[PDB]
Amino acid sequence: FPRVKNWEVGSITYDTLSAQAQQDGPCTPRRCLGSLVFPAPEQLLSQARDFINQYYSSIKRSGSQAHEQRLQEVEAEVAATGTYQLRESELVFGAKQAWRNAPRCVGRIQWGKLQVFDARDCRSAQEMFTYICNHIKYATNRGNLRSAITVFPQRCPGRGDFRIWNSQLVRYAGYRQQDGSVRGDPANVEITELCIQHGWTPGNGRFDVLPLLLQAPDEPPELFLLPPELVLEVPLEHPTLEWFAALGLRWYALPAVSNMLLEIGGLEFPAAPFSGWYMSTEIGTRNLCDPHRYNILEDVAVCMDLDTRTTSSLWKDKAAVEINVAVLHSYQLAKVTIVDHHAATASFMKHLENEQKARGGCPADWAWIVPPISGSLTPVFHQEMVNYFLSPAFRYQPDPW
Amino acid sequence: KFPRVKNWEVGSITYDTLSAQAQQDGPCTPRRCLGSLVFPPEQLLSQARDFINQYYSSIKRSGSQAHEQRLQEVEAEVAATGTYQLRESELVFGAKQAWRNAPRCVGRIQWGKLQVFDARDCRSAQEMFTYICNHIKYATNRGNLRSAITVFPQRCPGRGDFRIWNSQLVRYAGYRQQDGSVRGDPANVEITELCIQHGWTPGNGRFDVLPLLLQAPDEPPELFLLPPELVLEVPLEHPTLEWFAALGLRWYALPAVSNMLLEIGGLEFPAAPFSGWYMSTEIGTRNLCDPHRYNILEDVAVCMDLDTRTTSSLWKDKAAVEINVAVLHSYQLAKVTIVDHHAATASFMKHLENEQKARGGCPADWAWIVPPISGSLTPVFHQEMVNYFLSPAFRYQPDPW
Ligand code: HEM
Ligand code: HEM
Ligand SMILES: Cc1cc(N)nc(CCc2cc(CCN3CCN(C)CC3)cc(F)c2F)c1
Ligand SMILES: Cc1cc(N)nc(CCc2cc(CCN3CCN(C)CC3)cc(F)c2F)c1
Ligand SMILES: C[C@H](O)[C@H](O)[C@H]1CNc2nc(N)[nH]c(=O)c2N1
Ligand SMILES: C[C@H](O)[C@H](O)[C@H]1CNc2nc(N)[nH]c(=O)c2N1
Ligand SMILES: [Cl-]
Ligand SMILES: [Cl-]
Ligand SMILES: [Gd]
Ligand SMILES: [Gd]
Ligand SMILES: [Gd]
Ligand SMILES: [Zn+2]
């Protein structure tokens, strides 16, 4: 059992939950690959069996009538159909567990508070679209954001997958330019080109909300424009730098990841978008300051009259902090839920403590948990962490194109 | 079997073929990543052989007369004595390689430029102190710092170790109070109480340079007052925050680590202090702003009239950046070599590309390479890295008590 130390406080725990880590990560005793971004009925049975065990442990019914009955039910379903179906309460529990198990999520103190929309009866991309609109509407909640997941039909033999081709429900277009540059968000050039290829009439702004490309089983993806009133946005301004507003910067309220695969008991839901609310660094540091994203850092620094010709002025660090301030101020001014990196890491520390008492540990990816600015100012920097894969889980999956 | 390594900023891909040589198993398994953890007879011949091979291949003299002949000499030396002595050029080579192989060192672009003082003819702490003093003065060089290592005699059975008890050659004292809390550096309370135990009279200050505890083999440690004119310190002032000087903050010029064991070709050097120059975040972010270190962050923010009542003002971030500005400014004004985290990480990327061409990869500990402020503002943040143990190496070792 790995000993885990907190270096700010000196406290020591042992991550006993790691001994249950099912699927294998990328590291070996020879070499650590922790920094990498991307790391048969009987086996379906044993995964299902383990998850059912988890579920019945959660409802304090381990080794009971209902429990063995369910185990029995699932085996007979797998023998008769090659798969099985989650009860609604198992689906809700499985989606919360997937979030709880997600090692790169710093927002996991909230894991128990997740609204699960069961769209497993979804019949078409049109119906998929309506479920998504209602997810966006519920989660956004006029800026008082609520965490939600909508679970579309599971992967099953004989039919294709439901897929949302967009990486998030709300994403800004990235248009390749006349001089090789990108207008808008360079992370989204690929999905943008797919949208245009699929009949979308592009804009040419920097913050053009993308249409959804929604794929029903064994179907070409179908284009759907999001009702503009469903997409809550936040114009960005800085509390004391009034020129900042003339940047014309915006971000959207709702972070809704739509390209990940939800795995529960060996069942796979390739389409199960989930949303919570932003941590400000995601927007202010990564989305706005990454050189390969909007890349506003130097322009903000020039505007702040910082000395950008020497690194030792820390012009980057100063301009980045003010961009993060602008994000936090703007979302608070718009009354859109947002959490700064200090509050978020502070709640994650309570999560680790809750999880140590609850499960004997907590799978966490230090490199993703530590925020991208002010790392060692947050308490997670000084927390050793054990990274491992537990199921139920959100998994990456290939792009359907 | 050759890890794909991606840079997520430019999109470039390398394969770390050097990882295949990893000797000492690290702490990670396919089951769980422990990458964020701080602290994870004739077998001497197999390491010696490989090291002698490294030396001669590095000088294009593999499979040659001197190579074959040196192989016999070490073979014969171990045969008669059970160990061997490094040739001067080999010791130089091994020290440079151990630095080059240090995965947590961001300044390895400098690995080729290292002054190696050979102290293998040493005995008694008085000789150690002279060697240490020659090192400090050469390394300090009136602020024009020069990388240097002093290699005291190797370990051999029966004979007690040469050990410097201090973690660094320059450390500030840490004093408990009528309330248990620490005056000075809480990182050195242990060695502060040990020096005090060995007949040192404590000061009253927050920046008392500790005395050295030098351990001759099988002899008890011996206190030594460092000559005050040999300990170059930098008073901390801020370029535009006039009141910063009045905080009385100081840091010393020379980061000289004196607790790590140098391993070269199977030989172990428990006393081998190495020094270079500071990266500004080491002082300004970790030493001054860690909560378990000088913990000055709030004091500076109060002086800046920042809103410490809400985390989302990012007062912590703003205060930290100005402390880092004051470190860089103060060292540059004192004309003491220092490097900001942008310059250091940029050079490290250059180092990675060099090592890719030279050796097919580079052991790098992502969590230690990425600086503790403005992580994603540096290129190393977006660079995937592979971490593994190569020899020769700097290794941690137990405290000699
Ligand atoms: C409610 C507030 C939430 C906060 C503050 C939050 C915070 C974060 C942050 C900052 C990341 C880093 C991702 C990146 O840098 O791209 C992340 C990742 C992640 N979050 Fe959370 N999140 C929240 C809600 C949720 C919800 C509701 C779910 C699932 C139901 C979830 C599941 C995940 C997963 C799977 C990742 C992994 C990212 C990846 O591997 O690409 N999060 N979260
Ligand atoms: C010349 C300028 C140098 C710079 C700018 C530099 C920078 C750094 C930094 C920032 C760290 C992080 C460690 C921490 O935060 O505690 C580090 C670690 C390290 N450095 Fe360098 N360093 C330099 C010279 C050297 C030299 C000359 C050697 C050996 C001959 C060396 C060997 C190491 C080792 C072994 C570590 C690992 C520290 C540990 O594991 O605790 N460095 N360096
Ligand atoms: C629900 C939620 C809350 C919140 N606060 N933020 C987010 C966005 C972060 C996020 C991003 C992703 C995409 C990951 N990238 C990695 C780099 N690769 C090149 C492209 C894909 C997946 C998430 F699962 C995820 F959560 C989501
Ligand atoms: C040569 C050089 C250049 C430079 N820029 N910085 C340094 C200091 C970094 C450094 C720090 C350490 C100690 C790290 N932890 C160990 C546990 N302890 C409780 C807290 C501090 C060991 C090094 F071997 C080492 F190198 C050295
Ligand atoms: C190479 C490195 O793994 C990559 O830049 C990671 C580092 N940590 C991260 N952490 C978060 N939260 N999000 C990210 O996208 C990344 N990117
Ligand atoms: C727990 C975590 O690994 C620990 O705080 C590490 C993180 N990264 C670090 N990086 C450097 N350069 N120095 C450190 O002391 C640490 N501490
Ligand atoms: Cl995002
Ligand atoms: Cl230090
Ligand atoms: Gd203003
Ligand atoms: Gd402009
Ligand atoms: Gd004042
Ligand atoms: Zn690992």
PDB file of N, CA, C and O in Angstrom, chain A residues 7 21 24-25 27-32 35 37 285 290 311-312 317 322 332 340-342 372 374-376 384-385 387-388, chain B residues 8 20 22 25-26 28-33 36 38 285 292 311-312 317-318 340-342 372 374-376 382 384-385 387-388:
ATOM      1  N   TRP A   7       3.020  17.462   2.215  1.00  0.00           N
ATOM      2  CA  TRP A   7       4.263  18.093   2.656  1.00  0.00           C
ATOM      3  C   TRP A   7       4.055  19.440   3.322  1.00  0.00           C
ATOM      4  O   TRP A   7       4.962  19.916   4.019  1.00  0.00           O
ATOM      5  N   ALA A  21      -7.557  -1.036  -8.223  1.00  0.00           N
ATOM      6  CA  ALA A  21      -7.462  -0.500  -9.577  1.00  0.00           C
ATOM      7  C   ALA A  21      -7.523  -1.597 -10.629  1.00  0.00           C
ATOM      8  O   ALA A  21      -6.588  -2.399 -10.755  1.00  0.00           O
ATOM      9  N   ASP A  24      -5.293  -1.116 -16.446  1.00  0.00           N
ATOM     10  CA  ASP A  24      -3.893  -0.798 -16.229  1.00  0.00           C
ATOM     11  C   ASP A  24      -3.542   0.530 -16.885  1.00  0.00           C
ATOM     12  O   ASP A  24      -3.952   0.808 -18.017  1.00  0.00           O
ATOM     13  N   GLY A  25      -2.791   1.351 -16.156  1.00  0.00           N
ATOM     14  CA  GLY A  25      -2.298   2.599 -16.681  1.00  0.00           C
ATOM     15  C   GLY A  25      -1.040   2.383 -17.502  1.00  0.00           C
ATOM     16  O   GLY A  25      -0.685   1.257 -17.855  1.00  0.00           O
ATOM     17  N   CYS A  27       2.269   3.324 -16.759  1.00  0.00           N
ATOM     18  CA  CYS A  27       3.569   3.292 -16.094  1.00  0.00           C
ATOM     19  C   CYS A  27       4.016   1.876 -15.785  1.00  0.00           C
ATOM     20  O   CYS A  27       3.203   0.977 -15.574  1.00  0.00           O
ATOM     21  N   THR A  28       5.329   1.699 -15.720  1.00  0.00           N
ATOM     22  CA  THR A  28       5.963   0.472 -15.269  1.00  0.00           C
ATOM     23  C   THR A  28       7.033   0.829 -14.253  1.00  0.00           C
ATOM     24  O   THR A  28       7.352   2.008 -14.059  1.00  0.00           O
ATOM     25  N   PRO A  29       7.605  -0.164 -13.565  1.00  0.00           N
ATOM     26  CA  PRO A  29       8.738   0.145 -12.687  1.00  0.00           C
ATOM     27  C   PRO A  29       9.916   0.712 -13.445  1.00  0.00           C
ATOM     28  O   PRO A  29      10.723   1.431 -12.852  1.00  0.00           O
ATOM     29  N   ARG A  30      10.018   0.434 -14.746  1.00  0.00           N
ATOM     30  CA  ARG A  30      11.119   0.960 -15.543  1.00  0.00           C
ATOM     31  C   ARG A  30      10.960   2.457 -15.796  1.00  0.00           C
ATOM     32  O   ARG A  30      11.947   3.201 -15.780  1.00  0.00           O
ATOM     33  N   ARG A  31       9.733   2.917 -16.021  1.00  0.00           N
ATOM     34  CA  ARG A  31       9.522   4.303 -16.418  1.00  0.00           C
ATOM     35  C   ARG A  31       8.102   4.735 -16.088  1.00  0.00           C
ATOM     36  O   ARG A  31       7.151   3.969 -16.271  1.00  0.00           O
ATOM     37  N   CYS A  32       7.972   5.977 -15.632  1.00  0.00           N
ATOM     38  CA  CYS A  32       6.687   6.595 -15.358  1.00  0.00           C
ATOM     39  C   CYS A  32       6.215   7.365 -16.587  1.00  0.00           C
ATOM     40  O   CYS A  32       6.968   8.157 -17.158  1.00  0.00           O
ATOM     41  N   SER A  35       2.722  11.787 -17.087  1.00  0.00           N
ATOM     42  CA  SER A  35       2.441  13.051 -17.767  1.00  0.00           C
ATOM     43  C   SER A  35       1.759  12.877 -19.120  1.00  0.00           C
ATOM     44  O   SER A  35       1.399  13.878 -19.747  1.00  0.00           O
ATOM     45  N   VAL A  37      -0.973  12.596 -21.827  1.00  0.00           N
ATOM     46  CA  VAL A  37      -2.370  13.009 -21.852  1.00  0.00           C
ATOM     47  C   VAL A  37      -3.278  11.803 -22.073  1.00  0.00           C
ATOM     48  O   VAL A  37      -4.269  11.608 -21.362  1.00  0.00           O
ATOM     49  N   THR A 285      -6.510  30.848 -17.880  1.00  0.00           N
ATOM     50  CA  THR A 285      -5.147  30.413 -18.157  1.00  0.00           C
ATOM     51  C   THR A 285      -5.084  29.558 -19.421  1.00  0.00           C
ATOM     52  O   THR A 285      -4.413  29.914 -20.388  1.00  0.00           O
ATOM     53  N   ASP A 290      -3.074  29.750 -23.448  1.00  0.00           N
ATOM     54  CA  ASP A 290      -2.269  28.738 -24.134  1.00  0.00           C
ATOM     55  C   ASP A 290      -1.804  29.291 -25.479  1.00  0.00           C
ATOM     56  O   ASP A 290      -2.602  29.909 -26.199  1.00  0.00           O
ATOM     57  N   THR A 311      12.041  38.213 -20.030  1.00  0.00           N
ATOM     58  CA  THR A 311      11.199  37.284 -19.281  1.00  0.00           C
ATOM     59  C   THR A 311      11.220  37.602 -17.796  1.00  0.00           C
ATOM     60  O   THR A 311      10.249  37.329 -17.084  1.00  0.00           O
ATOM     61  N   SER A 312      12.312  38.180 -17.318  1.00  0.00           N
ATOM     62  CA  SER A 312      12.485  38.396 -15.890  1.00  0.00           C
ATOM     63  C   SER A 312      11.562  39.473 -15.338  1.00  0.00           C
ATOM     64  O   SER A 312      11.492  39.627 -14.114  1.00  0.00           O
ATOM     65  N   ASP A 317       3.453  36.171 -16.248  1.00  0.00           N
ATOM     66  CA  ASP A 317       2.785  35.840 -14.996  1.00  0.00           C
ATOM     67  C   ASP A 317       1.799  36.927 -14.593  1.00  0.00           C
ATOM     68  O   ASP A 317       0.692  36.629 -14.134  1.00  0.00           O
ATOM     69  N   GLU A 322      -4.059  38.757 -14.239  1.00  0.00           N
ATOM     70  CA  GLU A 322      -5.145  39.698 -14.494  1.00  0.00           C
ATOM     71  C   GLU A 322      -6.192  39.104 -15.438  1.00  0.00           C
ATOM     72  O   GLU A 322      -7.381  39.421 -15.315  1.00  0.00           O
ATOM     73  N   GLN A 332     -18.657  36.392 -12.033  1.00  0.00           N
ATOM     74  CA  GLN A 332     -19.388  36.806 -10.847  1.00  0.00           C
ATOM     75  C   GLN A 332     -20.346  37.943 -11.180  1.00  0.00           C
ATOM     76  O   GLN A 332     -21.497  37.938 -10.735  1.00  0.00           O
ATOM     77  N   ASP A 340     -12.685  29.688  -8.316  1.00  0.00           N
ATOM     78  CA  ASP A 340     -11.283  30.000  -8.563  1.00  0.00           C
ATOM     79  C   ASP A 340     -10.412  28.819  -8.137  1.00  0.00           C
ATOM     80  O   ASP A 340     -10.864  27.919  -7.423  1.00  0.00           O
ATOM     81  N   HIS A 341      -9.129  28.843  -8.534  1.00  0.00           N
ATOM     82  CA  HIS A 341      -8.299  27.658  -8.311  1.00  0.00           C
ATOM     83  C   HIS A 341      -7.962  27.444  -6.846  1.00  0.00           C
ATOM     84  O   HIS A 341      -7.640  26.319  -6.455  1.00  0.00           O
ATOM     85  N   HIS A 342      -8.046  28.485  -6.023  1.00  0.00           N
ATOM     86  CA  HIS A 342      -7.747  28.314  -4.608  1.00  0.00           C
ATOM     87  C   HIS A 342      -8.893  27.616  -3.899  1.00  0.00           C
ATOM     88  O   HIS A 342      -8.675  26.696  -3.103  1.00  0.00           O
ATOM     89  N   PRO A 372      -2.956  25.378 -13.450  1.00  0.00           N
ATOM     90  CA  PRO A 372      -1.892  25.762 -14.388  1.00  0.00           C
ATOM     91  C   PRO A 372      -1.217  27.093 -14.083  1.00  0.00           C
ATOM     92  O   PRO A 372      -0.207  27.406 -14.731  1.00  0.00           O
ATOM     93  N   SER A 374      -0.034  29.337 -10.402  1.00  0.00           N
ATOM     94  CA  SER A 374       0.026  29.373  -8.947  1.00  0.00           C
ATOM     95  C   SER A 374      -0.035  27.986  -8.329  1.00  0.00           C
ATOM     96  O   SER A 374      -0.616  27.818  -7.260  1.00  0.00           O
ATOM     97  N   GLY A 375       0.587  26.992  -8.976  1.00  0.00           N
ATOM     98  CA  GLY A 375       0.546  25.627  -8.475  1.00  0.00           C
ATOM     99  C   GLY A 375       0.799  25.453  -6.991  1.00  0.00           C
ATOM    100  O   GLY A 375      -0.064  24.949  -6.269  1.00  0.00           O
ATOM    101  N   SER A 376       1.967  25.882  -6.508  1.00  0.00           N
ATOM    102  CA  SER A 376       2.363  25.680  -5.122  1.00  0.00           C
ATOM    103  C   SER A 376       1.693  26.649  -4.161  1.00  0.00           C
ATOM    104  O   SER A 376       1.848  26.496  -2.948  1.00  0.00           O
ATOM    105  N   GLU A 384       1.043  14.499  -2.122  1.00  0.00           N
ATOM    106  CA  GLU A 384       1.311  13.347  -2.962  1.00  0.00           C
ATOM    107  C   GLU A 384      -0.012  12.695  -3.323  1.00  0.00           C
ATOM    108  O   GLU A 384      -0.972  12.741  -2.555  1.00  0.00           O
ATOM    109  N   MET A 385      -0.073  12.128  -4.523  1.00  0.00           N
ATOM    110  CA  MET A 385      -1.298  11.520  -5.020  1.00  0.00           C
ATOM    111  C   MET A 385      -0.982  10.205  -5.705  1.00  0.00           C
ATOM    112  O   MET A 385       0.090  10.033  -6.290  1.00  0.00           O
ATOM    113  N   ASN A 387      -2.323   7.751  -8.668  1.00  0.00           N
ATOM    114  CA  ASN A 387      -3.153   7.775  -9.869  1.00  0.00           C
ATOM    115  C   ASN A 387      -3.434   6.352 -10.325  1.00  0.00           C
ATOM    116  O   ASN A 387      -2.502   5.574 -10.564  1.00  0.00           O
ATOM    117  N   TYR A 388      -4.715   6.020 -10.470  1.00  0.00           N
ATOM    118  CA  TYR A 388      -5.100   4.686 -10.906  1.00  0.00           C
ATOM    119  C   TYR A 388      -6.508   4.744 -11.490  1.00  0.00           C
ATOM    120  O   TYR A 388      -7.221   5.741 -11.351  1.00  0.00           O
TER     121      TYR A 388
ATOM    122  N   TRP B   8       2.193  19.101 -26.800  1.00  0.00           N
ATOM    123  CA  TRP B   8       0.813  19.493 -27.079  1.00  0.00           C
ATOM    124  C   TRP B   8       0.677  20.939 -27.533  1.00  0.00           C
ATOM    125  O   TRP B   8      -0.423  21.350 -27.917  1.00  0.00           O
ATOM    126  N   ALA B  20      14.637   2.684 -22.499  1.00  0.00           N
ATOM    127  CA  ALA B  20      14.872   1.242 -22.487  1.00  0.00           C
ATOM    128  C   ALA B  20      16.068   0.850 -21.625  1.00  0.00           C
ATOM    129  O   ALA B  20      16.194  -0.322 -21.256  1.00  0.00           O
ATOM    130  N   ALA B  22      16.678   2.004 -18.557  1.00  0.00           N
ATOM    131  CA  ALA B  22      16.428   2.340 -17.158  1.00  0.00           C
ATOM    132  C   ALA B  22      16.828   1.195 -16.233  1.00  0.00           C
ATOM    133  O   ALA B  22      16.322   0.076 -16.355  1.00  0.00           O
ATOM    134  N   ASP B  25      14.512   0.336 -10.813  1.00  0.00           N
ATOM    135  CA  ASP B  25      13.070   0.404 -10.937  1.00  0.00           C
ATOM    136  C   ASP B  25      12.527   1.549 -10.090  1.00  0.00           C
ATOM    137  O   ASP B  25      12.882   1.697  -8.918  1.00  0.00           O
ATOM    138  N   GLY B  26      11.686   2.379 -10.701  1.00  0.00           N
ATOM    139  CA  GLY B  26      10.951   3.390  -9.982  1.00  0.00           C
ATOM    140  C   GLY B  26       9.769   2.803  -9.233  1.00  0.00           C
ATOM    141  O   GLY B  26       9.625   1.581  -9.091  1.00  0.00           O
ATOM    142  N   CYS B  28       6.393   3.128  -9.867  1.00  0.00           N
ATOM    143  CA  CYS B  28       5.128   3.002 -10.573  1.00  0.00           C
ATOM    144  C   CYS B  28       4.919   1.574 -11.076  1.00  0.00           C
ATOM    145  O   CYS B  28       5.870   0.837 -11.357  1.00  0.00           O
ATOM    146  N   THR B  29       3.661   1.183 -11.165  1.00  0.00           N
ATOM    147  CA  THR B  29       3.248  -0.092 -11.727  1.00  0.00           C
ATOM    148  C   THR B  29       2.124   0.167 -12.715  1.00  0.00           C
ATOM    149  O   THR B  29       1.506   1.236 -12.694  1.00  0.00           O
ATOM    150  N   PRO B  30       1.830  -0.797 -13.600  1.00  0.00           N
ATOM    151  CA  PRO B  30       0.678  -0.647 -14.500  1.00  0.00           C
ATOM    152  C   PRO B  30      -0.604  -0.332 -13.745  1.00  0.00           C
ATOM    153  O   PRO B  30      -1.543   0.245 -14.297  1.00  0.00           O
ATOM    154  N   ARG B  31      -0.616  -0.684 -12.462  1.00  0.00           N
ATOM    155  CA  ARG B  31      -1.779  -0.533 -11.597  1.00  0.00           C
ATOM    156  C   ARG B  31      -1.944   0.882 -11.044  1.00  0.00           C
ATOM    157  O   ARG B  31      -3.078   1.339 -10.858  1.00  0.00           O
ATOM    158  N   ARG B  32      -0.847   1.580 -10.750  1.00  0.00           N
ATOM    159  CA  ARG B  32      -0.952   2.877 -10.102  1.00  0.00           C
ATOM    160  C   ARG B  32       0.318   3.666 -10.355  1.00  0.00           C
ATOM    161  O   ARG B  32       1.424   3.121 -10.285  1.00  0.00           O
ATOM    162  N   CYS B  33       0.143   4.948 -10.636  1.00  0.00           N
ATOM    163  CA  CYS B  33       1.237   5.871 -10.856  1.00  0.00           C
ATOM    164  C   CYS B  33       1.585   6.540  -9.539  1.00  0.00           C
ATOM    165  O   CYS B  33       0.717   7.127  -8.885  1.00  0.00           O
ATOM    166  N   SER B  36       4.142  11.427  -8.454  1.00  0.00           N
ATOM    167  CA  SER B  36       4.154  12.640  -7.659  1.00  0.00           C
ATOM    168  C   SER B  36       4.722  12.426  -6.258  1.00  0.00           C
ATOM    169  O   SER B  36       4.650  13.335  -5.431  1.00  0.00           O
ATOM    170  N   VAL B  38       7.528  12.366  -3.529  1.00  0.00           N
ATOM    171  CA  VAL B  38       8.829  13.028  -3.419  1.00  0.00           C
ATOM    172  C   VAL B  38       9.941  11.996  -3.283  1.00  0.00           C
ATOM    173  O   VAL B  38      10.905  11.987  -4.059  1.00  0.00           O
ATOM    174  N   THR B 285       8.987  31.627  -4.820  1.00  0.00           N
ATOM    175  CA  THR B 285       7.738  30.910  -4.631  1.00  0.00           C
ATOM    176  C   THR B 285       7.800  29.876  -3.518  1.00  0.00           C
ATOM    177  O   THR B 285       6.959  29.896  -2.616  1.00  0.00           O
ATOM    178  N   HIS B 292       4.624  26.050   4.859  1.00  0.00           N
ATOM    179  CA  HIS B 292       5.528  25.429   5.815  1.00  0.00           C
ATOM    180  C   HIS B 292       6.952  25.966   5.697  1.00  0.00           C
ATOM    181  O   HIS B 292       7.860  25.418   6.321  1.00  0.00           O
ATOM    182  N   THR B 311     -10.719  34.562  -1.818  1.00  0.00           N
ATOM    183  CA  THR B 311      -9.713  33.893  -2.642  1.00  0.00           C
ATOM    184  C   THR B 311      -9.774  34.380  -4.077  1.00  0.00           C
ATOM    185  O   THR B 311      -8.748  34.424  -4.761  1.00  0.00           O
ATOM    186  N   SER B 312     -10.955  34.784  -4.539  1.00  0.00           N
ATOM    187  CA  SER B 312     -11.150  35.054  -5.958  1.00  0.00           C
ATOM    188  C   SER B 312     -10.615  36.411  -6.374  1.00  0.00           C
ATOM    189  O   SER B 312     -10.628  36.722  -7.567  1.00  0.00           O
ATOM    190  N   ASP B 317      -1.997  35.035  -5.747  1.00  0.00           N
ATOM    191  CA  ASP B 317      -1.277  35.020  -7.011  1.00  0.00           C
ATOM    192  C   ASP B 317      -0.522  36.322  -7.247  1.00  0.00           C
ATOM    193  O   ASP B 317       0.616  36.309  -7.726  1.00  0.00           O
ATOM    194  N   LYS B 318      -1.165  37.455  -6.971  1.00  0.00           N
ATOM    195  CA  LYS B 318      -0.538  38.743  -7.212  1.00  0.00           C
ATOM    196  C   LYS B 318       0.658  38.939  -6.285  1.00  0.00           C
ATOM    197  O   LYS B 318       1.725  39.378  -6.725  1.00  0.00           O
ATOM    198  N   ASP B 340      15.043  33.161 -14.320  1.00  0.00           N
ATOM    199  CA  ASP B 340      13.612  33.099 -14.108  1.00  0.00           C
ATOM    200  C   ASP B 340      13.057  31.797 -14.688  1.00  0.00           C
ATOM    201  O   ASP B 340      13.692  31.126 -15.505  1.00  0.00           O
ATOM    202  N   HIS B 341      11.863  31.432 -14.232  1.00  0.00           N
ATOM    203  CA  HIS B 341      11.281  30.155 -14.643  1.00  0.00           C
ATOM    204  C   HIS B 341      10.926  30.106 -16.130  1.00  0.00           C
ATOM    205  O   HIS B 341      10.889  29.009 -16.706  1.00  0.00           O
ATOM    206  N   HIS B 342      10.690  31.248 -16.778  1.00  0.00           N
ATOM    207  CA  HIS B 342      10.471  31.219 -18.221  1.00  0.00           C
ATOM    208  C   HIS B 342      11.757  30.886 -18.955  1.00  0.00           C
ATOM    209  O   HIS B 342      11.777  29.997 -19.812  1.00  0.00           O
ATOM    210  N   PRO B 372       6.558  26.138 -10.092  1.00  0.00           N
ATOM    211  CA  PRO B 372       5.428  26.179  -9.159  1.00  0.00           C
ATOM    212  C   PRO B 372       4.547  27.410  -9.275  1.00  0.00           C
ATOM    213  O   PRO B 372       3.564  27.503  -8.539  1.00  0.00           O
ATOM    214  N   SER B 374       2.744  29.784 -12.586  1.00  0.00           N
ATOM    215  CA  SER B 374       2.592  29.972 -14.027  1.00  0.00           C
ATOM    216  C   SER B 374       3.014  28.734 -14.816  1.00  0.00           C
ATOM    217  O   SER B 374       3.575  28.848 -15.900  1.00  0.00           O
ATOM    218  N   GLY B 375       2.748  27.554 -14.270  1.00  0.00           N
ATOM    219  CA  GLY B 375       3.071  26.311 -14.947  1.00  0.00           C
ATOM    220  C   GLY B 375       2.741  26.286 -16.428  1.00  0.00           C
ATOM    221  O   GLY B 375       3.637  26.091 -17.259  1.00  0.00           O
ATOM    222  N   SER B 376       1.469  26.509 -16.787  1.00  0.00           N
ATOM    223  CA  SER B 376       1.098  26.355 -18.190  1.00  0.00           C
ATOM    224  C   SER B 376       1.557  27.515 -19.054  1.00  0.00           C
ATOM    225  O   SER B 376       1.388  27.459 -20.272  1.00  0.00           O
ATOM    226  N   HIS B 382       3.317  21.828 -21.483  1.00  0.00           N
ATOM    227  CA  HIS B 382       2.617  21.198 -22.598  1.00  0.00           C
ATOM    228  C   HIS B 382       3.437  20.094 -23.229  1.00  0.00           C
ATOM    229  O   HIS B 382       3.020  19.518 -24.246  1.00  0.00           O
ATOM    230  N   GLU B 384       4.894  16.406 -22.937  1.00  0.00           N
ATOM    231  CA  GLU B 384       4.876  15.122 -22.255  1.00  0.00           C
ATOM    232  C   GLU B 384       6.305  14.668 -21.955  1.00  0.00           C
ATOM    233  O   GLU B 384       7.244  14.948 -22.700  1.00  0.00           O
ATOM    234  N   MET B 385       6.460  13.954 -20.850  1.00  0.00           N
ATOM    235  CA  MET B 385       7.779  13.576 -20.390  1.00  0.00           C
ATOM    236  C   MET B 385       7.758  12.148 -19.880  1.00  0.00           C
ATOM    237  O   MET B 385       6.725  11.632 -19.447  1.00  0.00           O
ATOM    238  N   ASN B 387       9.829   9.594 -17.208  1.00  0.00           N
ATOM    239  CA  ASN B 387      10.645   9.617 -16.009  1.00  0.00           C
ATOM    240  C   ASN B 387      11.167   8.218 -15.724  1.00  0.00           C
ATOM    241  O   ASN B 387      10.394   7.251 -15.717  1.00  0.00           O
ATOM    242  N   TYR B 388      12.470   8.120 -15.471  1.00  0.00           N
ATOM    243  CA  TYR B 388      13.133   6.841 -15.259  1.00  0.00           C
ATOM    244  C   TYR B 388      14.533   7.100 -14.725  1.00  0.00           C
ATOM    245  O   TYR B 388      15.071   8.204 -14.851  1.00  0.00           O
TER     246      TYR B 388
END
